[PDB]
C-alpha cells in the first residue's frame, strides 16, 4: 500500500508541472526507505557544495589541512554569486569559514578556490565521493558551467538514492569522527538558502540541515536534508527535479510537496 500510493502521488505531481521528480527518503530509526525515480540521473547544481564541505573536513581530520589556515585570494577575479568571498577578499578567510560559505551561501568563489587548491578539481571531488562508496555521483565541470542542466546530459549529475546514501554516510555515519562530524552538522543546520524546500515540509521545531541547488535553467532545482524530529532518530530526504523547457522556472512548492509525501511514505 503506502509505498505505491506515494508513487502515484509524485507521478501526478511531476505531471502537474510538466517535469520529473526524483526522491529518496530513509528513516534511520527503522531503516524504512522510499524511492521514486531514485536511480535516475538529475543535475547536481550547487547541491554538490555540501559534499565539497565534507571533503574539506575529511582533509582536516587526516591532518592534510588545518581548519584555521588563512586562504589568501587578494588578486582573484571572483565568480558570479560570491557574496561571502567578495567581502573578505582583502584579508582572506580561514579554510573552515570558506568551506562553510560554500555550503551555507552557495558561494562560487569559495567553491572554485577550494577545488583548485585543496581538492584536485572536479575529478578530485568525484574521487572523494568514490572513496565513501558513492558510484553514481559525477562532477565534470567547474562553477558556473556545471549549471547548464541540458536535457540528456550526464555531466554533473547523481541519483536521489546516491545522494541520500552519501549524506547519511557523511552526516550520520563514520566518515568523519565525532568532533568533525558535529562541525559538518552545524554547517548543514546553518544553511540559508533552504527555507522554501524540505524545511517547509516539516514542523518549525524540528532541526534540519540542508543544501539546495538551482541551475536557473530547465526548471532544475533540488534539496537534500538531515532532519532530527523531536524525540526520534534522524531522517534523510533527497529531492531532485527538472522541467521540460529551457525557460521553465524551478518550483520550490513542488520540492516541498515531494518532501511532504516522502516523509509520510517512510513513516
Swiss-Prot record:
One of its GO terms (biological process) is beta-lactam antibiotic catabolic process. Partially inhibited by the beta-lactamase-blocking agents, clavulanic acid and tazobactam. Not inhibited by EDTA. Induction: Up-regulated by the carbapenem, imipenem. Expression probably regulated by upstream promoter elements. It is an enzyme of class 3 (hydrolase). The active site is at residues 46, 145. It catalyses: a beta-lactam + H2O = a substituted beta-amino acid. This is Beta-lactamase SME-1.
